[PDB]
């Protein structure tokens, strides 16, 4: 990943083994849960496409998820090539040729060319584009790992309200259908599926009730 | 405080002059950042090497379609289109830089430089900047356009960037 | 987070992966203890709102608590907008940006805008404001995670005074109240709920005795 | 709908309540039948898209059919957009812009814009295009509401030829097919499905016998 | 309601009796159904606030719904007064003062003032604002008159798919919680509550199936 | 009535037969409901006292109500003549004389005096006073016609809450008390007279009881 110097300029730097070790360990230990996308975006800030291909190829196991991510990256690269055709002929001396989708992916280009793209004037953010594509792929992967659907949630007679709302919001963050649909769901489905006693305790507070009073009602 | 960007204009490759723009980022900030960033090319894509595809003498010069090069395309740094930020500033005279659109909340990257007072456009196109240096370069450009907009020679943004 | 760089010019330095790993580990190992608030405040010194958003997204589990935190951040932003609306006044000769409830919460504010608001003279304390909001949310969360009320703390028949006062002060620190309420409670509730064998000992010492005197009295 | 006003200047005249009541009555008694498409085309002559939206909203019940109509209108709008692209840019002061695919359905087009598109020279046939779309939708709906197929129409043992041919032609008109296919369908199905005695009576007349001779054969 | 003349200007016109008669008949005969709002919006185009107060007071019976509408109008009027505060100082010569939240309803203003407000330069659309408020109130009324919730829909073993989808879309248009949530519901809840045989027939077409093939699958 | 010609004088126009036909139809079919007063005020707009006398005389049957209405008109005319002195003697040309109570009733004048009084500068509206008197009389009639009082409404054990609130609000519309007393009763006796189950439900609802909340609570 590129790093700025004392005078402000930046140059390529070898990827730290600690970053790779932490990434592989968090992938192994935390599997594929909603909290891998923020950590992935934090680990590889400013990483070249070669570094991202490293961080993806290094993930042993869960090869189906990695194949899904590869297919998503392939579709995004095809759409990028369709929306931005590259020109042919001689290239200007002060400009380097613009990358194609397969080259934005970093599959058929050298590291020096990535560094030249990233430190050009004006700079070309190939790393950020490929990171956005990988984040979309990881969103689709965490959508696939979702164990249950949002509608099938029903609290058991003994399962506490805390565990119920924990499971609900876990699969809700794993759903990621939309934002306003999520807002409507947390109003309706959250109170629609409570245990009868605590259910009517929550209905006593009306729809204006917030989550804090919703929990301290059934609390104790 | 308010950014200033320039355009080195070219007519079929012969250099013609530099137009520089003050972007009113203190009133239309999101509109001004999108023109600034597309001029520097810092987000990967932009105005450098795009042309003015529609120049109507006594009205305005329009350009900025860097994807389709004919007024049907262009994209913003926020996605392909975004909202009309506001309408504080009005089309008061030549040199005003205003956003082209395909109706409300459809701003992308096309802009037009007015060469006359066009009050009928008020309330319908966001104004976000004005020519600082170079208005006679904008005026000379008019001669290469027509009543319907078609230009006679290719007029390009040979280079562009930020000055301040 | 931004940091003073040689010489005297603050530049943006992205959050280090080791800090994120330390935060994930402390949230995994210690759950939601009263001490996490200081660990969080010390791990994110001078952090841009984007860094705090990253540190709140990298959490694994406890999605209900994160939802209360987000809702309290929204409430603080709403109140902040209400307490800081633009009243008509003559325009200032010098213009500096301004942070909205949504500009403070790092939702719609780009990293460059936050760097500007922080490094500009005079500085806009967006980082400290967002940290105060997150600290209020974490106080709410740790006061919710309290298993039992402070009023229910009672010593066992043979439970030593050591563990009794330890658990009592832990629950009291987790509990929320003004300092004078705590000053009254440590004098009215501590000695009363003790075991009678050592309760007589504490009564023999006196009502206004300090903690160390009672502790060495019932020692052994 | 706009109407020629004395003298020679079309002005906007809002839809009359009596027309809406007639439409509600015909969609209350006739419900969905082949005759509704012709009645609808006559009640809404030269109607602005807002008037057609008003006439489609006033229908009470049959929400599935209205949803089919809305979805087919959306499909036709998408096809019109794919066939007639709309170029972006400032409009000319004298002429109006080319309407997009959704400006026809009156969703985002104000009444003034439609009045302009209709009264301008040359006129833009937005009303007739939206009427063609609604007519396609109504054809879909009336072909769906058919209780039985045309192949299932068979005459009863003592059911007179009158009711048989009436029901057969009604189902054939409700059915959707090219007129060229119907020319073979009638000569293949009308005589075959009749009663055996009337079957021989019609076959005695000949294969290419007209409808009136075939009728007067088994008359009474 | 105002009406345009040959010269182009508009002036007040007495409300037609067979409009009041039609409105009272449609309100009583159809009671409250989703198709009363389009009829109301079509009947009173350009009506003054006095005409709308007439059309509301004239509705005999269902006084609870009319009181709900009055309360909704009441709250809406208060919000308008709070959002915009009258300016102080000298007033321009070519301009005169505006109405209040309660006067938008027309409760404490004469008809001539309404006509002056509607035909001023520039015109002030008090009629359209009060019509929007009444339409919102009628939406809440038709929400209350919904006989079930959206989740309780489960098709019976014998109830045909046509009746099931009709009931579903009826109570869905009567729900009006949102538009994208409606789009998610029509994908999930529509496919989740079918009868097992036709359920797996619909599952044979996958989620890409449209409504037309969805119904013609279970058809016949 | 008095139709205002478009850009012209307010020409007098005899009452159309449609108005009288609708009036006799409603007074025959609907007897004397609370809403008839709004429909009467709607049909007769800007009408001369001759028009109102024609609309009242055309009523067939219920002669006791007509005699009470005439007695109320006589009482109002006597009060008007008592609290307003009537001038006499020679009257200056171009200025009509003082309208008398028996004259403002239209029983001792022709159409010319009424048209002159409704066209003077400043205008002296005889129609808006005679209609006010007729509305007072019709209010007395509809109060007399009410079968049950407001204080004696009790909900049946099986009769649901909707029918109870319908009857309650109908009788309230028929009530004669002032508006503040009306608010008091519609605030208290509504929940104070319901069935015990939903009575306790609404008591659990507590203060600030609003009609839609009440009806959503008493569901099922």
Curated annotation (Swiss-Prot), chains A, C, D, E, F:
Disulphides: none
Coiled-coil segments: none
Mod. after translation: Phosphorylated possibly by host MAPK1; this phosphorylation is necessary for Pin1-mediated virion uncoating.
Region (Interaction with human PPIA/CYPA and NUP153): 57-95
Region annotation Dimerization/Multimerization of capsid protein p24: where it falls in the sequence: 145-220
Residues annotated as site: Cis/trans isomerization of proline peptide bond: 89-90
Domain of life of the native organism: Viruses
Transmembrane parts of this sequence: none
Subcellular location: Virion
Subunit: Homodimer; the homodimer further multimerizes as homohexamers or homopentamers. Interacts with human PPIA/CYPA; This interaction stabilizes the capsid. Interacts with human NUP153. Interacts with host PDZD8; this interaction stabilizes the capsid. Interacts with monkey TRIM5; this interaction destabilizes the capsid.
Role played: Forms the conical core that encapsulates the genomic RNA-nucleocapsid complex in the virion. Most core are conical, with only 7% tubular. The core is constituted by capsid protein hexamer subunits. The core is disassembled soon after virion entry. Host restriction factors such as TRIM5-alpha or TRIMCyp bind retroviral capsids and cause premature capsid disassembly, leading to blocks in reverse transcription. Capsid restriction by TRIM5 is one of the factors which restricts HIV-1 to the human species. Host PIN1 apparently facilitates the virion uncoating.
Protein name, as recorded: Capsid protein p24
This protein's encoding gene: gag-pol
From Swiss-Prot, chain B:
Keyword Glycoprotein: yes
Catalytic activity: [protein]-peptidylproline (omega=180) = [protein]-peptidylproline (omega=0)
Record-level GO cellular component terms: cytoplasm; cytosol; extracellular exosome; extracellular region; extracellular space; ficolin-1-rich granule lumen; focal adhesion; membrane
PTM characteristics: Acetylation at Lys-124 markedly inhibits catalysis of cis to trans isomerization and stabilizes cis rather than trans forms of the HIV-1 capsid. PPIA acetylation also antagonizes the immunosuppressive effects of cyclosporine by inhibiting the sequential steps of cyclosporine binding and calcineurin inhibition. Acetylation at Lys-124 favors its interaction with TARDBP.
Sorted UniProt keywords: Acetylation, Apoptosis, Cytoplasm, Glycoprotein, Host-virus interaction, Isomerase, Isopeptide bond, Nucleus, Phosphoprotein, Rotamase, Secreted, Ubl conjugation
UniProt activity-regulation remark: Binds cyclosporin A (CsA). CsA mediates some of its effects via an inhibitory action on PPIase.
Effect of residue 120 to H: No effect on peptidyl-prolyl cis-trans isomerase activity
Enzyme Commission number(s) of this protein: 5.2.1.8
GO annotation, biological process: activation of protein kinase B activity; apoptotic process; cell adhesion molecule production; cellular response to oxidative stress; endothelial cell activation; leukocyte chemotaxis; lipid droplet organization; negative regulation of oxidative stress-induced intrinsic apoptotic signaling pathway
Modified residues (N-acetylvaline): 1
CDD domains recorded: cyclophilin_ABH_like
Stretches assigned to the PPIase cyclophilin-type domain: 6-162
Sample GO molecular function, one term: peptidyl-prolyl cis-trans isomerase activity
Residue(s) carrying Phosphothreonine: 92
Modified residues (N6-acetyllysine): 27, 43, 75, 81, 124, 130, 132
Annotated family: Belongs to the cyclophilin-type PPIase family. PPIase A subfamily.
Role description: Catalyzes the cis-trans isomerization of proline imidic peptide bonds in oligopeptides. Exerts a strong chemotactic effect on leukocytes partly through activation of one of its membrane receptors BSG/CD147, initiating a signaling cascade that culminates in MAPK/ERK activation. Activates endothelial cells (ECs) in a pro-inflammatory manner by stimulating activation of NF-kappa-B and ERK, JNK and p38 MAP-kinases and by inducing expression of adhesion molecules including SELE and VCAM1. (Microbial infection) May act as a mediator between human SARS coronavirus nucleoprotein and BSG/CD147 in the process of invasion of host cells by the virus.
Protein name: Peptidyl-prolyl cis-trans isomerase A
Annotated organism of origin: Homo sapiens (Human)
Encoding gene per record: PPIA
